[PDB]
Swiss-Prot record, chain C:
UniProtKB keywords: Leucine-rich repeat, mRNA processing, mRNA splicing, Nucleus, Repeat, Spliceosome
Signal peptide: none
Name the UniProt record assigns to this protein: U2 small nuclear ribonucleoprotein A'
Functional summary from the UniProt entry: Involved in pre-mRNA splicing. Associates to U2 snRNA in a MSL1 dependent manner and is required for normal accumulation of U2 snRNA. Required for the spliceosome assembly and the efficient addition of U2 snRNP onto the pre-mRNA.
Gene: LEA1
Residues of the whole record sequence present: 1 to 167 of 238
MF terms in GO: U2 snRNA binding
LRR repeats: 51-71, 72-92, 94-115
Domain of life according to the entry: Eukaryota
Location(s), subcellular: Nucleus
All copies of domain LRRCT, residue ranges: 129-164
UniProtKB/Swiss-Prot annotation, chain E:
Protein name, entry field: Small nuclear ribonucleoprotein Sm D2
SMART domains reported in the protein's UniProt record: Sm
Role according to the record: Plays a role in pre-mRNA splicing as a core component of the spliceosomal U1, U2, U4 and U5 small nuclear ribonucleoproteins (snRNPs), the building blocks of the spliceosome.
Top-level lineage group: Eukaryota
Subcellular location(s) per record: Nucleus; Cytoplasm, Cytosol
Protein's organism: Saccharomyces cerevisiae (strain ATCC 204508 / S288c) (Baker's yeast)
PANTHER family (alphabetical): SMALL NUCLEAR RIBONUCLEOPROTEIN SM D2
Complex formation: Component of the Sm core complex, present in spliceosomal snRNP U1, U2, U4/U6 and U5. The core complex contains SMB1, SMD1, SMD2, SMD3, SME1, SMX3 and SMX2 (Sm proteins B, D1, D2, D3, E, F and G, respectively), and is probably a heptameric ring structure.
Any GO MF annotation of the entry: RNA binding
Sm domain residues: 17-94
InterPro entries (alphabetical): LSM_dom_sf, Sm, Sm_D2, Sm_dom_euk/arc
GO cellular component: catalytic step 2 spliceosome; commitment complex; cytoplasm; cytosol; nucleus; pICln-Sm protein complex; precatalytic spliceosome; Prp19 complex
Any one GO BP annotation for this protein: spliceosomal complex assembly
Curated annotation (Swiss-Prot), chain H:
GO CC, any one term: U2-type prespliceosome
Organism name: Saccharomyces cerevisiae (strain ATCC 204508 / S288c)
Lineage: Eukaryota, Fungi, Dikarya, Ascomycota, Saccharomycotina
Subcellular location(s) of the protein: Nucleus
Full protein segment contained here: 28 to 111 of 111
Keyword ATP-binding recorded: no
Note: Present with 504 molecules/cell in log phase SD medium.
Biological processes annotated in GO: mRNA splicing, via spliceosome; U2-type prespliceosome assembly
Role noted for this protein: Involved in pre-mRNA splicing. This protein is associated with snRNP U2. It binds stem loop IV of U2 snRNA.
RRM domain boundaries: 1-79
The protein, known as: U2 small nuclear ribonucleoprotein B''
Assembly and interaction partners: Belongs to the CWC complex (or CEF1-associated complex), a spliceosome sub-complex reminiscent of a late-stage spliceosome composed of the U2, U5 and U6 snRNAs and at least BUD13, BUD31, BRR2, CDC40, CEF1, CLF1, CUS1, CWC2, CWC15, CWC21, CWC22, CWC23, CWC24, CWC25, CWC27, ECM2, HSH155, IST3, ISY1, LEA1, MSL1, NTC20, PRP8, PRP9, PRP11, PRP19, PRP21, PRP22, PRP45, PRP46, SLU7, SMB1, SMD1, SMD2, SMD3, SMX2, SMX3, SNT309, SNU114, SPP2, SYF1, SYF2, RSE1 and YJU2. Interacts with RDS3. Interacts with LEA1.
Keyword line: mRNA processing, mRNA splicing, Nucleus, Ribonucleoprotein, RNA-binding
UniProtKB/Swiss-Prot annotation, chain J:
Annotated SMART domains: Sm (SM00651)
Protein name per UniProt: Small nuclear ribonucleoprotein E
The species this protein was found in: Saccharomyces cerevisiae (strain ATCC 204508 / S288c)
Record-annotated disulphide pairs: none
GO cellular component: commitment complex; cytoplasm; nucleus; pICln-Sm protein complex; precatalytic spliceosome; spliceosomal complex; U1 snRNP; U2 snRNP
Classification of source organism: Eukaryota, Fungi, Dikarya, Ascomycota, Saccharomycotina
Matches recorded under Gene3D superfamilies: 2.30.30.100
Cytoplasm as UniProt keyword: yes
Length: 80, 100, 164, 79, 94, 82, 56, 84, 72, 75, 69
RNA sequence: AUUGUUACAAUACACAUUUUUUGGGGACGGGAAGAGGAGACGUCGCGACCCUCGCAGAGUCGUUCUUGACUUGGUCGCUUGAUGUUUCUUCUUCCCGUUC
C-alpha cells in the first residue's frame, strides 16, 4: 500500500482513509473535510462488521462521521 | 552539614569491608550510566526505599543478585566503550571495579 | 517485451477502477497491447498492491500465472489471449470474476485444472473459447466447476445442475 | 503546567501504547499536538497474546491513547 | 491571565492530589488501578493537573483468561506516560 | 468554524440517514441543524439491529450518541468549500 | 527615536515623514504617520506611558 | 466515446450487470464508467471508454452478442457523457 | 439550605463511604480534602469489595469520574 | 414553562420526595429528597435509600450524589 | 450555547428512548441548552405508573419520538 | 539602447452533560449419503411464465461558442441464494485440496 511521510491532517486531505470505530466496525472512505473534533467527511462509507473470524461488508451512506467514537484513521490508497 | 548512613542497613548483616565494596560497585555503575543503575535498583517496585535510607532494602540473595547485575552492567559498558575482546579472569575485573 | 519488474513499476497505477476495490493495474507501458509472449513472470514486483482488476488483455500469454494472497486479483481481465491451460495453486480464493474471453482453450480435458473445483479453484468462469463449441460442454462445466455462477454471461441454473 | 507539553517536546521516538483494544503499537510519534493526536510511522498490530497483523502508515486520536511507552528514558518537562 | 493559572499550581498540594505530589517529591511506590481489571505498581517521578503521570519501575498485573482458572501475568516496564482517565485510585505505601 | 457543521446546515430538506451508538439505523428528512449536531426528522423509518423495524412520524436525535450522519452525493464539491 | 520597550523605532525628517519600524519582526512593514508637510518636525519623543508618540 | 447498449436481460441485478459489462468491455479498451447513471435497466446502459477507437471496435465486434440470453444491440451515443 | 460543596467541606476530617460503578468496591476511610473537580483523598482506607475487605490501604486518593455517591 | 436552573431553586424551597435512577444498575434505584443548589448537576440528597425495583432497603445516610451518575429526578 | 429547537415539540406527548433499554414517555413542559428536558409525565414498560413529574438529565437522552406530529 | 485599511482562518487559553479525558499412515477444510440444527424479524442477490418499451441527478430561462439563476429495478419462486438480532437443545462412509 502506497503512503508517503505525511506531516498533518491538512496535507493528507482528499485521500482514501480507513476509519476504526469504538466497538470495532471497520470503515473506508475519501476524507473530504476537517474539524476541531476530527469529524472527517467520508466521500462514500463502506462499513464492515465482525461478530464477537471473518469481516462483513456494506454500503449505506456517504456520511460525515463523528469524532467521539473514532479510534484511529489509516490511509488505504491515493486518488487520481 | 548533613549526615547520612550510606550503609543504610548492611553493617548488621554483612561486614564493613563488604559493605564498602558493595557501595563501590553501586557508585561505579551509577557513574558509568545512572539511568541503568536506577532501573536495576528499582526492578521490583515492592522493594521500596525507606524514609531514612539511600538504597532499597533487599534480602541477602536479592542483594547478591543486584550486585551481580551491577557488575554485568559495568563490564558491558566497558566493553562498549574501549572495544576490549574479553575479560581474562575475575581478579583482572577487580582492578576495573575499584580503580577505573 | 517480456514481463519484467521494471515494466510493472512503470505501469500506470493511478486511475482506480471505481466499480470495485482500488488500483486497476495495467503492466508494462500498457497491459492492453503489452505483448507478453511468455507466462506472467515477475508478479512479486506488484506485491499484492490492490476487486483488483489486473487487466492483462490483448496479450500473448500462454498460461495464466498468479502469485498473491486471498484478496489480490478478484476481477482479473485476460481478454483476447492465447490461454492454453490455467492450472495453479497460488490464486485459490481471490480470482472470482475471471474475464477469459477469446482464449485458446481447445478441449474439455484442458479445463480439468479448473474442474474438481471443490478446493482446486474457489471460483472461475471461462467463456468465448474453442471448448465452448464442443458437445455437452456447458453441462460438463456445470458438473466439474460448481462454483461457476455465470457461464458465458448466462447463469448456471438449478435445472442445468440437475441435468449435469 | 501540563503533561502534554512534555509529549510535544519529544519526536521521532519508537514509543509503544496500550490502547483501549489492548494491542501494542511501537512507532514514531512524528507531529504530536495539544490534544494527544499522535501519527504512527511504522508499528505492530493485533486485530480483535497479540497476533501479527501490522500496518505501515497511521494516525491516532488522543482519546484512545491510554498509555505511551518509553523510547528515551529522560526526565525534562520544564523549559 | 497569569494569576488565574498560577494560583491553580498550589491547589495540587492543598487538595486531593497533595498525596500524589508528596509521592512524586519523595520517590516511593504506589498501587495504580485501571478500568479493565488491571493492577499496576510503580514509583512516581513527574505529575500534572489532570493526573497525567509518569513513573518508573512499572510492574503490571492483569488477567487474560476465563472465569474458571485465573492467570496472573507479569511484565517489567518503565518510563510510561499513562492517561488520567484510566487512573482510578492511587495510594502511597509506607 | 467547522466545515462538517456548515455542510450539515446546507443540507436542510434532504434524505439524510443516521446511525446511533446502539445501532439504530434511520432514514428520513432533515428538519434543522446547529453548532452541536442536534438532528430532527420527519417521516423517519426505523430499521434497527434488534430486528423489529418500524415507521416513525417524527424523531429528535442527540449528537453525542450519534456515530455518523449520512448525506447525499449532490453536495460534494460546491457550494461549501470554495 | 527609540521607544522605551526598545522595539519601536521612529525614523523621521523635518518635511513630515514619520515611519515607525518594529525591530522584533524584519518582515513587518513600517507604519507611516500623517504629519502635514508644511509643519516642520523638530523632534519625536515616546512618552513614558508607553503609548504616546509626541511629535514636536 | 460512449456506446449506448439496448435489448438486454432486465432480470439480472444492477451491480452484477455493471460488472458483467465491465468484464466484456475490458478487451477493447479501458472502461471509464464504473456504474450506470440511468438506473432503469432492461438494456439501457452507456459504456464510457477512454479511447474512441476502442469504442468503435466494441461497436463493431459486440453487435448482437449473446449476453444473459438476449443479443445486445450496440450503437453510438447521441450526446457526449458528463465524465468525458 | 445545605449545599453540596458545603456538605463536602463539613465532611472533611470525618468518616466517608464512596462506591464506584465499574468494579463496585466500597472504599471506607476518613476524608482529608477535596478540590473544584471533586477529587477524593482518604485516610485509613479499606477497600470493601462488596462487604469483604481486600486489605487495609492506609493513605489514599480517588478520582472524580469513577465514584457514584458519598455517605457516612 | 419551567427551566432547569430555577427548578433547583424550587426543589430547595420545597424539599419534596424523589426517586433517583442510576446509569449502570437498572434495578437498584435511589430514593430520598434533594436539598443543595449548584451550577452542575451534582446536589445533596438527604435521607437516601437504594431500593431494588422490578424489571429492598439499602443502608445509607445523606447521599451527595455525583453530577454525571444521576439518571432521573422527580419533584 | 446554541439552543435546540424544542419549541416545536412543546405541549405534546413524546415516547422517549433512554440509554440501557428504558422506554419512558411524557409531555414536554420545559427545555434548555444542556438538554435537561423538564417533562410532566412518566410511565415505565406491561405499562405501570411511577411518579407524575420527572426532570431527566442531558446525557441519558438519545431518542425521543413525538406522538402528536 | 513595496506602503496602508478591512474581512476570514492558523499560532497563544482548553477535567465537568453535543465530542480528546470515562459507561468496561495421521491431522485440518469443503461437498454428498445414512443414523440418532430449528423457528421469527428484517436487509441485498440466482431464475421468470411477469411487468414495463426506450439516449439521457432532472426541468426552465438569461447570455454567448460554454456557463450563472430559479424549481423538486417493483412482484413471484430459490426446485436446498447470501446475511445481522433473537430463543431453545453428534457419529459413520465416500470423494477433492493443504500439511508432515
Amino acid at each position: 500500500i502506497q503512503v508517503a511521510h505525511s506531516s498533518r491532517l491538512a496535507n493528507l486531505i482528499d485521500y482514501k482513509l480507513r476509519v476504526l470505530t469504538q466497538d470495532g466496525r471497520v470503515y473506508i472512505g475519501q476524507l473530504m473535510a476537517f474539524d476541531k473534533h476530527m469529524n472527517l467527511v467520508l466521500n462514500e462509507c463502506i462499513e464492515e462488521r465482525v461478530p464477537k473470524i471473518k469481516v462483513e461488508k456494506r454500503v449505506l451512506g456517504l456520511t460525515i462521521l463523528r469524532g467521539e467514537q473514532i479510534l484511529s484513521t489509516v490511509v488505504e490508497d491515493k486518488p487520481l | 552539614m548533613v549526615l547520612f548512613n550510606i550503609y543504610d542497613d548492611w553493617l548488621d548483616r554483612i561486614s564493613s569491608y563488604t559493605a564498602f565494596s558493595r557501595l563501590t560497585l553501586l557508585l561505579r555503575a551509577l557513574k558509568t550510566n545512572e539511568e541503568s543503575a536506577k532501573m536495576i535498583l528499582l526492578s521490583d517496585p515492592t522493594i521500596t526505599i525507606k524514609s531514612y535510607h539511600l538504597w532499597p532494602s533487599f534480602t541477602d540473595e536479592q542483594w547478591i543478585t543486584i550486585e551481580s547485575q551491577m557488575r554485568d552492567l559495568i563490564l558491558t559498558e566497558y566493553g562498549r566503550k574501549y572495544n576490549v575482546n574479553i575479560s581474562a579472569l575475575t581478579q583482572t575485573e577487580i582492578k576495573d571495579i575499584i580503580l577505573g | 517485451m517480456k514481463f519484467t519488474p521494471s515494466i510493472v513499476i512503470d505501469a500506470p497505477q493511478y486511475y482506480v477502477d471505481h466499480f470495485n476495490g482500488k488500483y486497476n493495474v495495467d503492466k508494462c507501458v500498457i497491459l492492453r497491447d503489452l505483448q507478453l509472449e511468455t507466462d506472467s513472470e515477475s508478479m512479486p514486483s506488484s506485491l499484492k498492491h490492490l476487486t483488483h482488476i489486473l487487466d492483462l488483455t490483448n496479450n500473448d500469454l500462454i498460461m495464466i500465472p498468479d502469485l498473491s494472497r486471498r484478496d489480490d486479483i478478484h476481477t482479473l481481465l485476460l481478454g483476447r489471449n492465447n490461454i492454453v491451460e490455467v492450472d495453479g495453486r497460488l490464486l485459490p480464493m481471490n480470482v472470482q470474476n475471471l474475464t477469459l474471453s477469446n482464449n485458446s482453450i481447445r478441449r474439455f480435458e484442458d479445463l480439468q485444472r479448473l474442474r474438481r473445483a471443490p478446493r482446486t479453484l474457489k471460483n472461475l468462469t471461462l467463456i468465448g473459447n474453442q471448448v465452448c463449441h464442443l458437445a455437452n460442454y456447458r453441462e460438463h462445466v456445470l458438473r466439474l466447476v460448481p462454483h461457476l455462477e455465470t457461464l458465458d454471461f448466462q447463469n448456471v441454473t438449478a435445472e442445468e445442475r440437475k441435468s449435469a | 503546567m501540563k503533561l502534554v507539553n512534555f509529549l510535544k517536546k519529544l519526536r521521532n521516538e519508537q514509543v509503544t501504547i496500550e490502547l483501549k483494544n489492548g494491542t501494542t503499537v511501537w512507532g514514531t510519534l512524528q507531529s504530536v499536538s495539544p490534544q494527544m493526536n499522535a501519527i504512527l510511522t511504522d508499528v505492530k498490530l493485533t486485530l480483535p497474546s497479540d497476533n501479527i497483523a501490522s500496518l505501515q502508515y497511521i494516525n491516532i486520536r488522543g482519546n484512545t491513547i491510554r498509555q505511551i511507552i518509553l523510547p528515551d528514558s529522560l526526565n525534562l518537562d520544564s523549559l | 491571565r497569569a494569576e488565574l493559572e498560577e494560583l491553580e499550581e498550589f491547589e495540587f498540594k492543598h487538595g486531593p492530589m497533595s498525596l500524589i505530589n508528596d509521592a512524586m517529591v519523595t520517590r516511593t511506590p504506589v498501587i495504580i488501578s485501571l478500568r479493565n481489571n488491571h493492577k499496576i505498581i510503580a514509583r512516581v517521578k513527574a505529575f500534572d493537573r489532570h493526573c497525567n503521570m509518569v513513573l518508573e519501575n512499572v510492574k503490571e498485573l492483569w488477567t487474560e483468561k476465563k472465569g474458571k482458572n485465573v492467570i496472573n501475568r507479569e511484565r517489567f516496564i518503565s518510563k510510561l506516560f499513562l492517561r488520567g482517565d484510566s487512573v482510578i485510585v492511587v495510594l502511597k505505601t509506607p | 468554524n467547522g466545515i462538517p457543521v456548515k455542510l450539515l446546515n446546507e443540507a436542510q430538506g434532504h434524505i439524510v440517514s443516521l446511525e446511533l451508538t446502539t445501532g439504530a439505523t434511520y432514514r428520513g428528512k432533515l428538519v434543522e441543524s446547529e453548532d452541536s449536531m442536534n438532528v430532527q426528522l420527519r417521516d423517519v423509518i426505523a430499521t434497527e439491529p434488534q430486528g423489529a423495524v418500524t415507521h416513525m412520524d417524527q424523531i429528535f436525535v442527540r449528537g453525542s450518541q450519534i456515530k455518523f450522519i449520512v448525506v447525499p452525493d449532490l453536495l460534494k464539491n460546491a457550494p461549501l468549500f470554495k | 527615536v527609540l521607544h522605551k520597550d526598545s522595539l519601536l523605532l521612529a525614523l523621521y525628517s523635518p518635511d513630515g515623514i514619520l515611519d515607525v519600524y518594529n525591530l522584533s519582526s524584519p518582515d513587518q512593514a513600517s507604519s507611516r504617520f500623517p504629519v502635514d508637510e508644511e509643519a516642520k518636525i523638530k523632534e519625536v519623543k515616546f512618552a513614558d506611558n508607553g503609548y504616546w508618540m509626541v511629535v514636536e | 466515446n460512449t456506446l449506448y447498449v439496448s435489448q438486454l436481460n432486465e432480470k439480472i441485478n444492477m451491480q452484477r450487470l455493471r460488472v458483467n459489462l465491465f468484464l466484456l468491455f475490458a478487451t477493447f479498451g479501458e472502461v471509464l464508467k464504473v456504474s450506470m447513471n440511468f438506473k432503469k435497466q432492461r438494456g439501457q446502459a452507456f459504456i464510457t471508454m477512454r479511447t474512441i477507437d476502442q469504442a468503435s471496435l466494441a461497436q463493431i465486434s459486440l453487435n448482437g452478442e449473446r449476453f444473459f440470453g438476449k443479443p445486445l444491440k450496440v450503437e453510438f451515443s447521441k450526446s457526449e457523457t458528463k465524465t468525458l | 439550605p445545605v449545599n453540596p460543596k458545603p456538605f463536602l467541606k463539613g465532611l472533611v476530617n470525618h468518616r466517608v463511604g464512596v462506591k464506584l460503578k465499574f468494579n463496585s468496591t466500597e472504599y471506607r476511610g476518613t476524608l482529608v480534602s477535596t478540590d473544584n473537580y471533586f477529587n477524593l483523598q482518604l485516610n485509613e482506607a479499606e477497600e470493601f469489595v462488596a462487604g469483604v475487605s481486600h486489605g487495609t490501604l492506609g493513605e489514599i486518593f480517588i478520582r472524580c469520574n469513577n465514584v457514584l455517591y458519598i455517605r457516612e | 414553562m419551567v427551566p432547569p436552573i430555577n427548578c433547583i431553586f424550587n426543589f430547595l424551597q420545597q424539599q419534596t420526595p424523589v426517586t433517583i435512577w442510576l446509569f449502570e444498575q437498572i434495578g437498584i434505584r435511589i430514593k430520598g429528597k434533594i436539598v443543595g443548589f449548584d451550577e452542575f448537576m451534582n446536589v445533596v440528597i438527604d435521607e437516601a435509600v437504594e431500593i431494588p425495583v422490578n424489571s429492598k432497603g439499602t443502608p445509607l445516610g445523606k447521599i451527595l450524589l455525583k453530577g454525571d451518575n444521576i439518571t432521573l429526578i422527580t419533584s | 450555547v446554541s439552543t435546540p429547537e424544542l419549541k416545536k415539540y412543546m405541549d405534546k406527548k413524546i415516547l422517549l428512548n433512554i440509554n440501557g433499554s428504558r422506554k419512558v414517555a411524557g409531555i414536554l413542559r420545559g427545555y434548555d441548552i444542556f438538554l435537561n428536558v423538564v417533562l410532566d409525565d412518566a410511565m415505565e414498560i406491561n405499562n405501570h405508573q411511577l411518579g407524575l413529574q420527572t426532570v431527566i438529565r442531558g446525557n441519558s437522552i438519545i431518542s425521543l419520538e413525538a406522538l402528536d406530529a
